[PDB]
A paper describes a structure:
The bifunctional alcohol/aldehyde dehydrogenase ([name]) comprises both an N-terminal aldehyde dehydrogenase (AldDH) and a C-terminal alcohol dehydrogenase (ADH). [name] is a crucial enzyme primarily in alcohol metabolism and catalyzes the conversion of the high-energy substrate acetyl-CoA to acetaldehyde and subsequently to ethanol. In vivo, full-length [name] oligomerizes into long oligomers known as spirosomes. As has been shown previously, the alcohol dehydrogenase domain of [name] forms homodimers that are essential for the formation of the larger full-length [name] spirosomes.
Here, we describe the atomic structure of the cofactor-bound ADH domain from [name] determined by X-ray crystallo­graphy to 1.65 Å resolution. The two forms superimpose well, with a root-mean-square deviation (r.m.s.d.) of 0.32 Å over 404 Cα atoms, and interestingly there are no obvious local differences in the binding site for NAD. The benzamide part of the NAD molecule is less ordered in the electron density, and it is likely that this part does not form strong interactions with ADH, allowing the moiety to exhibit a number of conformations. This is reflected in the B factors of the NAD moiety, where the adenosine diphosphate has an average B factor of 26 Å2 and the ribose-benzamide end has an average B factor of 49 Å2, which is higher than the average B factor of the protein model of 28 Å2. NAD interactions correspond to 3% of the total accessible surface area of ADH. Additional electron density was observed in the metal ion-binding site, as previously found in gADH, where it was identified as Zn2+. As ADH has been described as being reliant on binding to iron this density has been modelled as Fe2+, although it may also be a Zn2+ ion as observed in the homologue from G. thermoglucosidasius. The metal ion is coordinated by Asp653, His657, His723 and His737 with additional waters.
Author numbering:
A (entry chain A): 450 to 754, 769 to 869
B (entry chain B): 450 to 576, 581 to 756, 769 to 869
Write the structure that this text describes.
Amino acid sequence: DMLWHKLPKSIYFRRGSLPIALDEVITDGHKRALIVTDRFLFNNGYADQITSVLKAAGVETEVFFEVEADPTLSIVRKGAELANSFKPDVIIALGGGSPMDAAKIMWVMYEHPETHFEELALRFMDIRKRIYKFPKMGVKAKMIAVTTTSGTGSEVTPFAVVTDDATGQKYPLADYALTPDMAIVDANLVMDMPKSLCAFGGLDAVTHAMEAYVSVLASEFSDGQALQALKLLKEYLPASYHEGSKNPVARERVHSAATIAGIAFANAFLGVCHSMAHKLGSQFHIPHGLANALLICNVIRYNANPQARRRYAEIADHLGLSAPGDRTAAKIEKLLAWLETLKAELGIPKSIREAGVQEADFLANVDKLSEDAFDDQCTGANPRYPLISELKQILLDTYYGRDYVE
Amino acid sequence: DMLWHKLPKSIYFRRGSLPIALDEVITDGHKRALIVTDRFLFNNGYADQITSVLKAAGVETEVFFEVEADPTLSIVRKGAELANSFKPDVIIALGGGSPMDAAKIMWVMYEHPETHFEELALRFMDIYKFPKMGVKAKMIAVTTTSGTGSEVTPFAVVTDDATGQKYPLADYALTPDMAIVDANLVMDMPKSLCAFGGLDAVTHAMEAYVSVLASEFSDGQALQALKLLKEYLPASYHEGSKNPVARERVHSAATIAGIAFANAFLGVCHSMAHKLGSQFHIPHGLANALLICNVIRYNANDNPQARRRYAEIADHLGLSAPGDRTAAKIEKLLAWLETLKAELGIPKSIREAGVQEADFLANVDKLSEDAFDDQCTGANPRYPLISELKQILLDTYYGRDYVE
Ligand SMILES: NC(=O)c1ccc[n+]([C@@H]2O[C@H](COP(=O)([O-])OP(=O)(O)OC[C@H]3O[C@@H](n4cnc5c(N)ncnc54)[C@H](O)[C@@H]3O)[C@@H](O)[C@H]2O)c1
Ligand SMILES: NC(=O)c1ccc[n+]([C@@H]2O[C@H](COP(=O)([O-])OP(=O)(O)OC[C@H]3O[C@@H](n4cnc5c(N)ncnc54)[C@H](O)[C@@H]3O)[C@@H](O)[C@H]2O)c1
Ligand SMILES: [Fe+3]
Ligand SMILES: [Fe+3]
């Protein structure tokens, strides 16, 4: 029953931290850097912010900018083959969850060209006690994650997910050997995020912290960070959304908050909100953060039925939502009211139906969604052990915009 | 103005985590382990808890158990020479701040026998590139007090025997590769060690929260350490091993305070405590306990503001009442600390800690000057004058509250 707190060697942050952190990459003696990113970030000059600094110091650079919305095995393999040819001694992921997750798997494949993806996907889908260990990492290259959304927190986590394009099946990988060697959290890179990305990333971060706090693997080492992320998000996410680049402090606070939520869930994991959000995302092509935003309130209601209900009340107290003499039930209602108001000002629809999913389509798939969500690796940390029938009820309630009632 | 959050690769915790973490040391392929500890911990079988597990797996072991309070250059050099002869691939510090700090410097000397101590002391006193670490050996810190948090920090201090001068080293290459926080190792701590370590931890978290280098990445951890300490230190001191939950919570709290100050640093409480400790041989945690309330009063002087931050701590700890103004929140924070100190048997003044008046008066100017110069001073939210530090020291000597 040993627990842990496992983070990157260095997390660097503050506006302008990117070039300063890169100077350490240089002085560490790195000579060949592969940047892994997407087309938007390349076309908008974000990768140049990395390569210009490295080139000035005589570091050879290559940029792979072909990561798309969800990392696919074909793209990961292509990136790995570029690594095989270019031979980087540092891989630098630049972007949101998609480039960061893709880069982690490219890194494994580069370190171990003998290893088939099937071996990785079937053996290392979760964190658990094992006899056979993850293949040794960081021999050919170190991994740096530069996050440009606020955010997935992938820059500090042992997690990656890749879609097998041949079948559409998503494969989660998890091992602390995939935790980046360095995370760079520079809010200059998120000043121009559109409103939808700001909202979805921010509510993803809220969900990460919320699930990490009530997880059966929560501890005194993660609780403070989960609560801090929630406080920062409560205090700055509205302004970040409304004002964007006009309020750089709010953008910076939220960028930090998403990483801090990462610190918590990297160690405490998540719950059934993520389980269900994964399946909604895959089935209906709803962005991850939106899917979480749609489900989180009903998951709280469900989990609140070391009771989770006491923990939710602790969050209410931390966020200043409760009044003296409030009972647990009332504190939870106040937590829910806060979340509902936050969702409203961030333009989140009130139901999956209002997010554009047709009723017949939903009903035809809801049983499969419920079964798959039960089976999801995220379910194991949820404080309430679910039945498939209960997850179905949550999904239906969320589709029709009803509050879950036990 | 880049900031950072830098911790050991792994922090492992919970009662019984030591043997479980050691199994990972074994499976990582370590073959030769040097344990660095003190005589008390060796004689009470604490080192055997490590060596028995490693030996059973065919790992060669050696123990250096000669670390004393205030590690000296002679002792560090002797430990380094043992490392040079034994050739460990892992160094495992076992103990409080003295073995942990000593082990960090032994590690550097073993990794770099070519390097003169003067080079290290004069170049790396304050957060050159540090000479590459972790080539010959990884560093594991196993803390047995609650505590210094040294198991997660980039700090070590050694005394030059020849002169009595203390040399702080600070670099993230000294951060352990692994910290092990196993409260089974602290169940039998005596009351004074419990008190002094606990109040050291309170001070670490308090100074890290109001430090000019505080950030959103450390603040939550500083507040968590303070909440854990408020909630469990009274029971830990009173009940000891009869309340293992409290002992466990406080052991975690000391490390969590470490997480905060490893990154946000400290302030003038530590600056003054270092000098009181060196001059009068007052234990570090006792020295901090004697000074912390007056440092709060000093730092809280009205013209973010430290005073707002202290009020935030009061709110976090549930010490404030609705409608309380900042001043009243701070008075409630101070009252909490005073009551905690009372339970823990902390003297009400430096005089009552056994320091003779003539001795104190003869040294107070030097204490004030040295405290100003201490590396810890730079992070303090109030930029001090030597005259003000002198006043704090005198007030604390005579048991008076500092008044602006
Ligand atoms: N299933 C899981 O466990 C899990 C968890 C996290 C991540 N993921 C995956 O990662 C992705 C989520 O990452 P994300 O939400 O951060 O976004 P993303 O990486 O999918 O990026 C989404 C879009 O935003 C753009 N973008 C990125 N940074 C920007 C910026 N600063 N300004 C403007 N546009 C920017 C990207 O170029 C892209 O077009 C999804 O594909 C999701 O499936 C999955
Ligand atoms: N800034 C820095 O670099 C830094 C960091 C840490 C500590 N330090 C210094 O090191 C010291 C910190 O020491 P500490 O408080 O951990 O104590 P310590 O290591 O000096 O040990 C104090 C005594 O407690 C005993 N002891 C330790 N663990 C015990 C246990 N579980 N049960 C019973 N007895 C036990 C030891 O054997 C010793 O006799 C201070 O002097 C401090 O200034 C400096
Ligand atoms: Fe998520
Ligand atoms: Fe201290």
